[PDB]
Amino acid sequence: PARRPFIGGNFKCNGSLDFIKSHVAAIAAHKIPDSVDVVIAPSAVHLSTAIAANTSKQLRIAAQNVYLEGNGAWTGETSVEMLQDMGLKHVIVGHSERRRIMGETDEQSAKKAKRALEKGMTVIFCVGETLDERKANRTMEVNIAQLEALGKELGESKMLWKEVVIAYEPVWSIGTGVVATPEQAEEVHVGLRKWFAEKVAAEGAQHIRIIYGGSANGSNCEKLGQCPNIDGFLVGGASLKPEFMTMIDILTKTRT
Amino acid sequence: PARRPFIGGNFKCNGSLDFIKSHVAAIAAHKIPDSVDVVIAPSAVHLSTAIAANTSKQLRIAAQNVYLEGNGAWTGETSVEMLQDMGLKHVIVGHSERRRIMGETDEQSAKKAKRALEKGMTVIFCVGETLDERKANRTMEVNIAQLEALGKELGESKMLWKEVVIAYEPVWSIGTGVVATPEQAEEVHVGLRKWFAEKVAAEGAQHIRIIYGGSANGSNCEKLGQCPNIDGFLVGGASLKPEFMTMIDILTKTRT
Ligand SMILES: [Ca+2]
Ligand SMILES: [Ca+2]
Predict the structure, then answer these.
(1) What is the dihedral of CA B43, B48, B49, B53, to 10 degrees?
(2) How far is CA A185 from CA A28, A49, A232, A253, in A?
(3) Pairing outcome for strands A122-127 and A6-10
(4) Residue B168 exposed, middle or buried by CB count within 10 Å (0-12, 13-18, 19+)
(5) In this structure, how many other beta carbons lie within 10 angstroms of the beta carbon of residue A50?
(6) HEC states along A174-210?
(7) Which of A38, A90, A135, B30 has the most neighbouring CB atoms within 10 Å?
(8) Which of helix, strand or coil describes residue A212?
């Protein structure tokens, strides 16, 4: 029931070539212990540049999205095969900006994840409810439906769950500066542990990482990290700034 | 009423790092006259690699898609600003694989194009009808609705049309090996010229390029290129092969 802490930084649709070289170099220059997983996710056109600038043996690079077919006639998309050819092993799937703004459905998110996992990738799988859904008292029902879809696609092959990191990001917390309270986030995380224990495996539930995202930063992260079911963070805006490195330091001290 | 010929090659969701280096080098080694525009569009994660391998002063590199906002919280997307920072000036908008498979609407295609054009980019703007629509005798109505949307977004600023290249690709011809006959394609192109003359400008209609796509290759392209309203080609599968270079040679001889 001892879990390795995880922190991811999602650059989103931001960055120039020079900023990527500079900021990746600054993170890579920081001490990153071997006892914590640290991942950053640049925009797709910047992945090659980030890889070249990454001089750290610990720092990993992730893609922000992937398509759910292999190589073929899919103009504008990126395949799992392309990422692995570049040497990448991490990918974000189902981010709310894609679920709620660009119409990506529960099942499509689940199918993207399944294919990446079967190929041997680590998937940061995102779930979260909107303000309306929370007001209608549907928080846990929404979050569990999103996960259930993945369970459906995965099947009785529960071994693929081993490379899933679940990221809970309430939609009303994304980019708004309104971070959830420790009480709000821990409640949802506890909910998800119990679902995982019931629907997948009790021993598995003890080992899978569940991270919190949505306005997480260097000021508010320490208190959150003390919640027992919060294994780390998926960081948006702050991952573009010097305080990402400070978050790495605090995560290490809190949970290792 | 003399128009500069244009050929584009869309790699789609294909390629490895090594294949991109190798194939871009092979195209770049070919003689490309200054009297024809030649553009290739690698997948987004390969753009940097293609740029580095491109030793030609004539060859241009395009992106396969772009989003319709500037830099911000848009996980998985690419901005016009990112492309220009990389030194790119061409982008494909509204490819049918995105209209018909991934739900990209007429107006969204139009808004993507408008933003790219306002920033100074050249847009290869794709239109085309499905087999069902052609059977219901709606070919011209479909194609013109798709373009009208762009006219709507553009406005009384008809000067932005100067950097548009229209690509007609019947959907039933895309990736199927069923190329349209010269008669079928020329008919549609004539239709589009007349719309452009009526809704935009008679002098403009004399200068805008309209290219044909859909199973175009080195065997069937010469006859097509002799149609007066077909100014060149948007090439899919064949752009990944050695015959792309042969198509460049024939286009030059036919239309310059
Ligand atoms: Ca995030
Ligand atoms: Ca094409």
Answers:
(1) 120
(2) 30, 35, 12, 21
(3) unpaired
(4) buried
(5) 23
(6) CCCCCCCCHHHHHHHHHHHHHHHHHHCCHHHHCCCEE
(7) A38
(8) strand
Structure tokens at A154: 């995965």
Q: What is the resolution of this structure in A?
A: 2.1
Least CB-CB distance to B74: which of A13, A73, A78?
Answer: A13
| CB within 8 Å of chain A, chain B residues 166-195 | 174-175
Residue A161 buriedness (CB in 10 A; 0-12 / 13-18 / 19+):
buried
What are the tokens at B90? 């061409």
Is A44 in the B-facing interface, judged by CB distances under 8 Å? Answer: yes
Q: Does the CB of A215 have a partner CB in chain B at under 8 Å?
A: no
Contact A103 B98 (CB under 8 A): no
Return d(Cα B96, Cα B89) in angstroms, integer: 21
The answer to whether the Cα torsion of B115, B116, B119, B123 is positive or negative is negative
Residues of B in contact with A45 (CB under 8 A): 44-45, 47-48, 63, 78, 82-83, 86
Distance A219 CA to ligand 1 centre (A): 17
Within a 13 Å sphere around the CA of A2, how many CA atoms are in the beta-carbon half? 3
> Helix, strand, coil % (nearest 5) of chain A?
45, 15, 35
B14 lies within 8 A of chain A by CB: yes
Tokens encoding A163: 């490379």
- Domains recognised in chain B with CATH numbers: 1-256 (3.20.20.70)
Using an 8 Å Cβ cutoff, are A212 and A205 in contact?
no
Separation of alpha carbons A255 and A227, rounded Å? 10
Task: Based on the residue annotation, tell me whether A77 is a catalytic residue of this protein.
Answer: no
Q: How was this structure determined?
A: X-ray
Q: Which of A104, A129, A169, A186 is catalytic?
A: A169
Closest alpha carbon to B147 in B195, B98, B207 = B195
